[PDB]
């Protein structure tokens, strides 16, 4: 169980760690988060009390280094940093733990929610989508645009998600126009899975990463990516049975975790109605269809 210490909390802020959150009062003696489960990526995220604009945060994996948070009064945000002096870090942590000024990652033992939301998300793959090679952790915020959003303006600050475009030469083989548009299996299985992603584990991971950034930061381009990756599978007549069964589990946990009062903005009516009721896979997502119908029957 690892720890992310905080130097201090000089401004009042709501702090999230994965699906949990707590409010820290201005200058409240707070020194970080302990008992973080090893084996998963994590996200530590922030919303200032004065400016609910700009949710922002950091994806990290405590196996890759010792990370801490420190407020920067010039740039006006909580910044993640790496401490390279291993013994300095252990001594800081042990002192803050002895003084009981650390919130405890509050995982229930029955609860596999975080695993289920991050099964195929890796820190090495997150760094290939969020490019800042000098750091081992990755910053994301509400405003960052995607490569595809920019094609339609600061490149270093972009989410490089694999661009999916159903009316593009990449998606449509010459001479198979109608075939490939109405049945996207070629594009899913050959172009994306065999050619770009490399396996389904990587396709599921970017789809999971897209969802988490949409949910935690309200990142609009991330939501677009999540839905595009769902639609590409549901609109393929030929999908390996193991991928369909896994997709159903993935989406079930995403829909289960979504805050009810954000569904209006985070869920695209057209994609979900098409996917659950019209597409080739309309009958292959039993768990997802049951939770969607019992939790958001209005959208449908």
């Amino acid at each position: 169980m690892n720890t992310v210490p905080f130097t201090s909390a000089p401004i009042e802020v709501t702090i999230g760690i994965d699906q949990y959150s707590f409010n820290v009062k201005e200058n409240q003696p707070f020194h970080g988060i302990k008992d973080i489960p090893i084996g998963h990526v994590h996200v530590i995220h922030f919303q200032h009390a004065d400016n609910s604009s700009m949710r922002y945060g950091y994806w990290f994996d405590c196996r890759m280094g010792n990370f801490y948070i420190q407020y920067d009064p010039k740039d006006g945000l909580y910044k993640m940093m790496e401490e390279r002096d291993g013994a300095k870090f252990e001594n800081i942590v042990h002192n803050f733990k002895e003084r009981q000024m650390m919130v405890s990652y509050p995982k229930i033992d029955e609860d596999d929610t975080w695993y289920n939301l991050t099964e195929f998300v890796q820190m090495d793959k997150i760094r290939k989508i969020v490019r800042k090679d000098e750091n081992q952790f990755s910053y994301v915020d509400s405003s960052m645009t995607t490569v595809q959003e920019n094609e339609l303006s600061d490149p270093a600050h972009s989410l490089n998600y694999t661009v999916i475009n159903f009316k593009s030469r990449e998606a449509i083989r010459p001479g198979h126009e109608m075939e490939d548009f109405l049945d996207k299996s070629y594009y899913l299985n050959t172009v994306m899975l065999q050619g770009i992603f490399k396996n389904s584990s990587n396709y599921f991971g970017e789809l999971q990463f897209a969802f988490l950034n949409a949910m935690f930061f309200g990142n609009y381009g991330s939501s677009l990516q999540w839905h595009a990756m769902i639609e590409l599978i549901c609109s393929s007549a030929t999908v390996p049975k193991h991928m369909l069964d896994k997709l159903d589990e993935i989406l079930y946990y995403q829909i289960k975790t979504l805050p009810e009062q954000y569904s209006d903005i985070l869920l695209n009516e057209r994609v979900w109605n098409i996917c659950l009721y019209s597409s080739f896979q309309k009958n292959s997502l039993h768990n997802t269809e049951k939770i969607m119908e019992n939790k958001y029957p209005e959208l449908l």
């Binding site: 009316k167 593009s168 030469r169 449509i172 126009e177 109608m178 548009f181």
Partner: protein
């Protein structure tokens, strides 16, 4: 964006554009089977591709053999239309290729877009107008070449005859749309108006009769009356 009343004069500027109408591509007769069920029999169709500035009509005849053994024919028909329009564009010299293709039905947008991916600079546009191009098969010479076809064939016509020698494209298109609206609303009456006088003939190389300017005014008024009349006989006004 969409083509409507507000941007109507754009049809007659000097940027090459084509209308594509697919309403006569897939044509069937519905009939009963010996067992008392219903079946369809396809008949030859056509794609109506028209340059509104010049009158040049590219009439691609769709022979019933293209449907043999195929499923979901109404959907296929849109993709077949898009395939043939794309093939036509590719066949034209670069300086003759359109800058815009306006589809008369919005369901043609995605099929045409996908087939024209190789032409990113050709805009594919819908229209808010309810244009009467379905009535093209009420022009006797066009219907005749479609029904006689025994194989796929492209036939070129000028749908304006020689009108552009005397009138502008705007006026020619307006006359065409009036004639076709009349043929669509009451084909028999409309054809009575056009051929009533045995002394006005259709030249071998033309589609419509050889009316003088004055006779065209009389004809055009008669077509308007019909379209209003029928609008009464239909709405009881």
């Amino acid at each position: 964006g969409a083509m409507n009343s507000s941007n109507y004069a754009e049809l007659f500027n000097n940027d090459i554009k084509l209308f594509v109408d697919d309403t006569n591509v897939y044509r069937v007769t519905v009939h009963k089977t010996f067992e008392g069920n219903v079946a369809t029999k396809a008949i030859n169709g056509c794609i109506f591709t028209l340059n509104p500035k010049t009158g040049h009509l590219f009439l691609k005849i769709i022979h019933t053999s293209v449907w043999a053994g195929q499923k979901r024919l109404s959907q296929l028909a849109k993709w077949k239309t898009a395939e043939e329009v794309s093939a036509l564009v590719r066949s034209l010299p670069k300086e003759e290729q359109p800058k815009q293709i306006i589809v008369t039905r919005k369901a043609m947008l995605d099929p045409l877009e996908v087939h024209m991916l190789d032409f990113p600079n050709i805009a594919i546009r819908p229209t808010e107008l309810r244009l009467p191009f379905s009535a093209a098969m009420s022009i006797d010479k066009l219907s005749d070449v479609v029904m006689k076809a025994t194989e796929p064939q492209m036939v070129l016509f000028n749908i304006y005859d020689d009108w552009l020698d005397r009138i502008s494209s705007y006026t020619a298109f307006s006359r065409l749309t009036l004639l076709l609206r009349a043929l669509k609303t009451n084909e028999e009456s409309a054809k009575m108006i056009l051929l009533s006088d045995p002394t006005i003939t259709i030249k071998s190389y033309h589609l419509w009769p050889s009316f003088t300017d004055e006779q065209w005014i009389t004809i055009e008024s008669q077509m308007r009356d019909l379209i209003l009349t029928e609008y009464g006989r239909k709405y009881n006004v």
